[PDB]
Each structure stands twice: as structure tokens, then as C-alpha cells.
Amino acid sequence: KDGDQCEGHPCLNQGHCKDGIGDYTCTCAEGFEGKNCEFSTR
Numbered sequence: 001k002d003g004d005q006c007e008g009h010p011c012l013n014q015g016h017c018k019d020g021i022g023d024y025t026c027t028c029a030e031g032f033e034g035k036n037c038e039f040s041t042r
Contacts, residue, residue: 002022004019005019005020005022005023005024006018006019006024006026010024010026010036011026011027011028011036011037012032012034012036012037012038013032013036013037013038013040014029014037015027015028015029015032015036015037016028016029
């Protein structure tokens with residue numbers, strides 16, 4: 001039922017992405033910040 005949770009590019013701007021328990025998890029690289037790393041610290 002829950003094969004891949006990250007096969008749809010959940011994180012933006014090359015965030016860090018690792019599937020886990022369905023809700024997968026998305027971390028931002030040092031530089032981006034936000035739910036999807038949408039905001040940049042520029």
C-alpha cells in the first residue's frame with residue numbers, strides 16, 4: 001500500500017529526502033529552510 005512515499009519529489013530545491021513511515025521525511029540542506037526548503041536563506 002505504502003511503497004514509495006518520496007517518488008514524487010516532496011522536498012524542493014534538492015532538499016534531503018528519506019522515506020520512512022508513510023509520511024516520509026524531508027530535511028533541508030544547510031542553506032534552504034521550510035516545509036519543502038522552499039525558502040532560501042539568500
